[PDB]
């Protein structure tokens, strides 16, 4: 299986066969666009009028396609199709015990009413994550769960749990210009750890103003007392954000009526929208942020 090269009117396409080839081509040409399923790039060239004169397709590279079951969680190469993610994860949910599968089930909810068998069969994971759509339905989940990301460039290799710093500005991620996303390990749910994922049913502007969230609480052992709390939202800014001030304020607080009141006051304050925020739908958007959390709150209480 050798590297192929195609040239046309305006674009050059290199089909890389080896992770070394890929890492080398990105170093030699940091501008080069990576393309797996094309479900995002395709849109950009046709409707948003971008020309990327230079494209690398890493689809063939093993690594990038590998599905590994480590002790922390399940790692997926960045090129695996959302449909593989969904299939691997459906099996995990049905095989392992409930308590270890909160995140997976979060991911699977976002995965439910999302595109179609056609899109999910060719859309990559890494593809979604790196695209950094403000209304990506997955990034809020990976963020709230602290999904570990393995990022590689020629020579260097780092792993980092995804958090708010990973999405710095509109459409930007925190990759260096030579780096590619190698893999993604979705975490196993711990004891005393619960998770939920909700999304606005509908969408009205291209990549803004669709509320979607991942939510995670970790309690002190056998208690109702909060140890970690993460509430991440898409659809409320130009990027996946985290409700850091709100959730910080609730550490070692008890999961009850009062905390509900504080979190909602917090969410209305910190994720507040100006009455001319892009996307409109101001009031509905507020209401989903709190209503989503209320569902989380109520669902956690049942899980407790």
């Amino acid at each position: 299986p050798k590297q192929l090269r195609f040239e046309g009117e305006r674009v050059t396409w290199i089909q890389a066969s080896t992770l070394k080839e890929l890492l080398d081509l990105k170093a030699q040409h940091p501008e080069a666009k990576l393309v797996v399923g094309n479900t995002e790039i395709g849109i950009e060239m046709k409707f948003k009028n971008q020309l990327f004169p230079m494209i690398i397709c890493p689809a063939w590279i093993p690594e990038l396609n590998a599905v590994e079951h480590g002790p922390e969680g399940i790692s997926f190469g960045a090129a695996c199709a959302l449909s593989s993610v969904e299939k691997t994860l459906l099996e995990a949910v049905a095989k392992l015990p409930t308590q270890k599968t909160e995140v997976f089930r979060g991911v699977l909810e976002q995965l439910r009413w999302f595109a179609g068998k056609q899109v999910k069969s060719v859309a990559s994971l890494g593809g979604n994550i790196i695209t950094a759509s403000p209304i990506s339905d997955l990034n809020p989940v990976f963020m709230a769960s602290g999904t570990k990301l393995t990022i590689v460039s020629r020579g260097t290799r780092r792993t980092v749990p995804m958090d708010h710093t990973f999405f710095p500005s509109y459409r930007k991620t925190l990759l260096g210009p030579e780096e590619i996303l190698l893999s993604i390990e979705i975490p196993y749910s711990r004891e005393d750890e619960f998770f939920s994922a909700f999304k606005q049913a509908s969408r009205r502007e291209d990549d803004i103003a669709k509320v979607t969230c991942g939510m995670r609480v970790l309690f002190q052992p056998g208690s109702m007392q909060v140890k970690e709390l993460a509430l991440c939202y898409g659809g409320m800014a130009d990027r996946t954000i985290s409700a850091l001030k709100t959730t910080q304020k609730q550490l070692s607080k008890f999961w009850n009526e009062k905390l509900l009141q504080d979190v909602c006051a917090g969410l209305a304050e910190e994720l507040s929208l100006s009455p001319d925020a892009p996307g409109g739908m101001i009031e509905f958007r507020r209401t989903l942020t709190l209503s989503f959390f209320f569902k989380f709150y109520l669902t956690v209480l049942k899980k407790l």
């Binding site: 192929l4 090269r5 195609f6 040239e7 046309g8 009117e9 305006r10 674009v11 050059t12 396409w13 089909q15 393309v35 399923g37 094309n38 479900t39 395709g42 849109i43 060239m45 046709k46 409707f47 494209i55 397709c57 689809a59 093993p62 396609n65 199709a81 449909s83 009413w113 595109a115 179609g116 068998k117 056609q118 899109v119 069969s121 060719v122």
Partner: protein
């Protein structure tokens, strides 16, 4: 380099692949297989549905999955085999049961979304010969029909469950 893929079993050797060419454009306009339709070009309607098959050096097995042709660069398809509506049957030889079913069930009115629903269903059957009512209904989140109201299609295809 040469681009090599298959369509309806037939070898395609493209010596001057342009990276910008979508498979839809390639079928309709270079190959003349006009069964696959353009409906939106953004992957939302399914009118361009085809089935792709590649050998996966990993599962051992050959996999079959459905795909949007309006978004699929031919350049991703080296050593992949495409099957279109005209590849599974025809009123000239024999309709595939998927085709005959949608036809006799009044699941096709204007007909422009039919070839892709045929393909979306045909793909499911390739992966699961005896699928559930659950699996049949969900097989079509990526196909839109403006004519039928969907009820007759789902009823026609439900005969493939149990």
């Amino acid at each position: 380099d040469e681009l090599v893929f298959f369509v309806n079993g037939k070898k395609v050797v493209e010596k001057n692949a342009d990276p910008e060419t979508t498979l839809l454009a390639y079928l309709r306009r270079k190959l003349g297989l006009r069964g696959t339709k353009l409906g939106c070009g953004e992957g939302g309607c399914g009118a361009c549905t085809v089935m792709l098959s590649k050998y996966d050096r990993l599962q051992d097995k050959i996999i079959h999955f459905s795909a949007n042709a309006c978004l699929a660069p031919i350049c991703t398809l080296h050593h992949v085999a495409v099957t279109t509506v005209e590849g599974i049957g025809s009123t000239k030889t024999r309709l595939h049961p998927v085709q005959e079913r949608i036809a006799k069930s009044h699941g096709s009115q204007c007909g422009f979304c039919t070839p892709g629903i045929v393909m979306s269903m045909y793909t499911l059957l390739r992966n699961q010969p005896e699928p559930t009512v659950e699996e049949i209904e969900d097989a079509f989140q990526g196909n839109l029909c403006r004519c039928t109201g969907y009820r007759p299609i789902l009823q026609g295809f439900r005969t493939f469950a149990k």
